[PDB]
Design a protein around this nucleic acid. Sequence first.
RNA 1: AGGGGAUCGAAGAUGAUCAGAUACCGUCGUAGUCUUAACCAUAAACUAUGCCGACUAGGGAUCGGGUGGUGUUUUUUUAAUGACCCACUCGGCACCUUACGAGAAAUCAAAGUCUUUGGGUUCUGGGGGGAGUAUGGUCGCAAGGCUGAAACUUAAAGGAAUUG
Lengths: 97, 217, 87, 117, 206, 25, 62, 129, 96
Amino acid sequence: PKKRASNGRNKKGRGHVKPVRCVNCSKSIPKDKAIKRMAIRNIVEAAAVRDLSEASVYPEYALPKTYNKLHYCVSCAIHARIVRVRSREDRKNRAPP
Amino acid sequence: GWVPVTKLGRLVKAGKITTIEEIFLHSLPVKEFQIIDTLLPGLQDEVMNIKPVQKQTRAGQRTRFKAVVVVGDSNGHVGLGIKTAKEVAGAIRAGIIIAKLSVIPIRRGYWGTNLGQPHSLATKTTGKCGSVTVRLIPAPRGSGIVASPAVKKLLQLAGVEDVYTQSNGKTRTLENTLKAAFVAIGNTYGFLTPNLWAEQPLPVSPLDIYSDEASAQ
Amino acid sequence: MENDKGQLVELYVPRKCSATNRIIKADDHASVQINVAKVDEEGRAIPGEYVTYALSGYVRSRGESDDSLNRLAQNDGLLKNVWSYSR
Amino acid sequence: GRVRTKTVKRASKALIERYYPKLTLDFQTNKRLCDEIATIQSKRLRNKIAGYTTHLMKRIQKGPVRGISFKLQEEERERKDQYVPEVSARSNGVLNVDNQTSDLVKSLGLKLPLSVI
Amino acid sequence: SLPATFDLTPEDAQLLLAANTHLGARNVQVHQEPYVFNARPDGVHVINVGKTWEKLVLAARIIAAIPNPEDVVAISSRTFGQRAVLKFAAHTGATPIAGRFTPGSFTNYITRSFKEPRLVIVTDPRSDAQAIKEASYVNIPVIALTDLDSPSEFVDVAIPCNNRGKHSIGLIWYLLAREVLRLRGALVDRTQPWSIMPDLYFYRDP
Amino acid sequence: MRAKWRKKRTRRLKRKRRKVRARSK
Amino acid sequence: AKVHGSLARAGKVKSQTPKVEKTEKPKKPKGRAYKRLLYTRRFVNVTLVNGKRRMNPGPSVQ
Amino acid sequence: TRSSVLADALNAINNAEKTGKRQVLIRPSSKVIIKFLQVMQKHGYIGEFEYIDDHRSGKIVVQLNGRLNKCGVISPRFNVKIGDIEKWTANLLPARQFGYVILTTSAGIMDHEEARRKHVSGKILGFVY
Amino acid sequence: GKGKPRGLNSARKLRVHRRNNRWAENNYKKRLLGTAFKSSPFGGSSHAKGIVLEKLGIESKQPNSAIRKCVRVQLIKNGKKVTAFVPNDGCLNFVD
RNA sequence: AGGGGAUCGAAGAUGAUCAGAUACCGUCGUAGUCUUAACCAUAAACUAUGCCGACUAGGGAUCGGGUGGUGUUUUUUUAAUGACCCACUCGGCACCUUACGAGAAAUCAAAGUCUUUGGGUUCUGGGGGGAGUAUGGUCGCAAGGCUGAAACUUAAAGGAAUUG
Ligand SMILES: [Mg+2]
Ligand SMILES: [Mg+2]
Ligand SMILES: [Mg+2]
Ligand SMILES: [Mg+2]
Ligand SMILES: [Mg+2]
Ligand SMILES: [Mg+2]
Ligand SMILES: [Mg+2]
Ligand SMILES: [Mg+2]
Ligand SMILES: [Mg+2]
Ligand SMILES: [Mg+2]
Ligand SMILES: [Mg+2]
Ligand SMILES: [Mg+2]
Ligand SMILES: [Mg+2]
Ligand SMILES: [Mg+2]
Ligand SMILES: [Mg+2]
Ligand SMILES: [Mg+2]
Ligand SMILES: [Mg+2]
Ligand SMILES: [Mg+2]
Ligand SMILES: [Mg+2]
Ligand SMILES: [Mg+2]
């Protein structure tokens, strides 16, 4: 029987959309599916701001950031515990953490 | 000796209500099995089945007995008890209690010429309990209760004389057949025919006439 | 339920809902009987004599137990300008 | 880990509910009381019990405890729950009103002090 | 039926405007719309007092007629309305139900809270649903305090207060009791107010 | 065996048969 | 299957069951006679029971 | 497309009674609707109906009164010989001692009760009980 | 509703369509393909007579075990070679 | 068939892994991947849910259109017009609660208005195998598509849910 009433993830009013490549699995999965995160960080991490904000030129400066929109896939989005097997009802909760 | 914890229980033991219909008419949630024992003695029980069932302990297995009892006079009131426990003997009697608490009324009727004392049902009725659906159909005199031995017996205690049937679904699961047969006869008083079309003005509920008489310690 | 020689058979004659006039079931344990006190000249309520409505399992279950009572209240003269037929 | 079992607590809640003002915050005396007002099979339990119902006490006299109530407190709540001030409603400068709530009274047949918004 | 005295009187009415009973929710709900008077600017709802009053009267009357005044279970799990239902219990007989309902009250004998009443009053159909739902298992009429967004299910005669808070929940309970005393019992002269305060019915904590 | 491959099988049979037969026109 | 099995032991048992002659006894009544012999028995006098009334036991309980 | 108009109407009527409602709006007022509504109203299964003039085809507001279990149509409007009228009533009426199947005979739209009296038979329309 | 045609004129379809769908009915189909006559080792006939060829020790299926006794038969009318089961104990010596 | 052939990459080749490893992983690479003209007609071509017509219950977002609002925000002075707000209301993509009702259940605003069995209408199924097989026919350059048996065989095959 049907596990998910949305089947995969949102279709409804399309029937097909272009797929992408699982950022780590190197797989392939339609854009409508596929777990997604927006990986922003600092160039020089946290511990290093000391040596960095000190041993430079420029007043204080302004730390740069990286912008990587990850596309995972149920295979490697589970393995990397990006998501996980929530209980029967728990599954319904579309609510973001 | 019987000690009524219920309000309806008191007024019955205390002779303030003496008839069964007095409870149906006012639609009163019966809780004590002693009530219907008093209001309705000369009752009869027929034990329908004893079909043991099984499962698990947190390792191996669980295994008990399942009993089916119908109770009835032969006159308009009938009930169904399904109970399963650790003993045959006790889960039987256990049901005769749950049977009685379930006693329901019948609008028995005529197939045609209303010549003295109904011989059938009001109208066509029908019950369901998953898959099985039994249908009850009025009948001429001399005919009989045309049904499967189970249903018939339930329709015997129901006190029916002549009725036709048309059961559909897995008639073989005894428990589910009987329940819907019950569900059927318990629906006769459900049908608003033009006999009952008139207007009466609503009795006041004996839970308020002898209200002073009833209430708690 | 008459018969041959007009005798009254049929072991019991069901009440009837007042918001639909549909038979009040023998096991309709969501059906109910409201009893409204009839007053006398100024204030004093009267034991014994009350105004009485009777609502059904179905009507009540679907939330229509307020509108239907009010409808029935104004009507038998228990209320004034609370429920308004036309809407 | 020291977790007093139910059989202890179920009796501490039981001695307080019965014999309250005959008890006190002390351990030693309460221990003696149990020999009179109760019956306990073992000496160690007796104390184990005594030592809990005496724990409750020291916070009973600090603020009531959830499942537990006795006589001398039950009217002490009836005392506090009878306060009634000068009044509130009252009216401190007519009846301050909003819009259409005025139209509500305007079309109701009532006098009433007024105010707009 | 009911004479000219039972008319509303802006003596009373003022307490209702003062207690802010006339202030309703921003979700009208299909069944409560008869009680709507009209809508405020900047999203509020104005309820109709003459209806709340008239209801209350009928409520008050239905409270009466009931013979033994002690099997009339008046419930609030809700904080605000809890203190009130203790007081309503004081005045008219009425076994109250403060705080937890303990599922298995009306159905299931054996329990030590087997109130088997013949009327239930409720303060808030939401937070007291288990109270309502269970009452509808065993043939029991139900008086209830509604707002505008309220569970109309298995409640008869609804009294549209505010129940959101302030003193509406007390006042309506106060007046409720006040009127079931002016109804039969011992108050008489339904024209004269009461030595009893309104703030006798409110909250606490502090 | 997998419905997909059991098809491939029955397709393989059919051609060999198509061939064994036309070994006599 | 295997279709040639051993025809050798064609009729073992019935060819080696102890002969025992069927004992003589008085002939039973025939016709209406018989069906009377049932009625007057099977429920007129009744015999041994159990709580359900049995039919053909032997050693019984005891 | 709309195909029965009558059945469309009795549907609404039926659906209305079930859901506890005691009034229906109907589209679109046909004459067959009316007589049907009449023969119903006679035996008591409905209140009074009030036709509405749109400059179109019509509307009807019927007053309901509990006591209606099922009205309903039997499409296709079958032929009925006169000795077969019993075969229907037997088939689709709850009991011998009441309920109504209504026809359409060349005499007019009547119930099977009346049709029996005039000794006419036609083509079946529907039922009431 | 109901998915079939309801009309007063669809009697054409209504009857023809069952004549179609009758063909999934096994016995109807056997009766109308005359399999009875053609395929069966009898004629269709109730009984049939033939001569004995050999005797077989047909071993029983699972989960039993024995050697069911059987003869091979040359059907007279048919020429059809068919094996039959000899029933009851040691009857297989009544036949040669 | 011609063009194009960056990429990735069936075949194949190679390096490892393994008892074996024709695989998975690594590298190399044909066809292919793009296109143009022709073919092919099939996918879990999915909502595993025919189409039109009516009816039965609430809640809120959002898309398109329209409507009403001595609304908000816009010029250098507050009118236009732009967006934005609120209410309405058609026609959408969906969601939420609910469950009167239905269902074997899972569940369903239809999968409801069905033993109180009929609005119109197309299509398909009738235990499991044998088998999408054989045979004829037909369309295709081909691969194949469409059409489609029986002999014989078998008591289960199968669904949803529950407990281990
Ligand atoms: Mg697709
Ligand atoms: Mg896709
Ligand atoms: Mg079915
Ligand atoms: Mg296999
Ligand atoms: Mg292939
Ligand atoms: Mg051979
Ligand atoms: Mg290779
Ligand atoms: Mg290995
Ligand atoms: Mg290979
Ligand atoms: Mg070509
Ligand atoms: Mg296909
Ligand atoms: Mg539609
Ligand atoms: Mg459910
Ligand atoms: Mg039904
Ligand atoms: Mg078949
Ligand atoms: Mg191929
Ligand atoms: Mg077997
Ligand atoms: Mg499958
Ligand atoms: Mg399964
Ligand atoms: Mg499991």
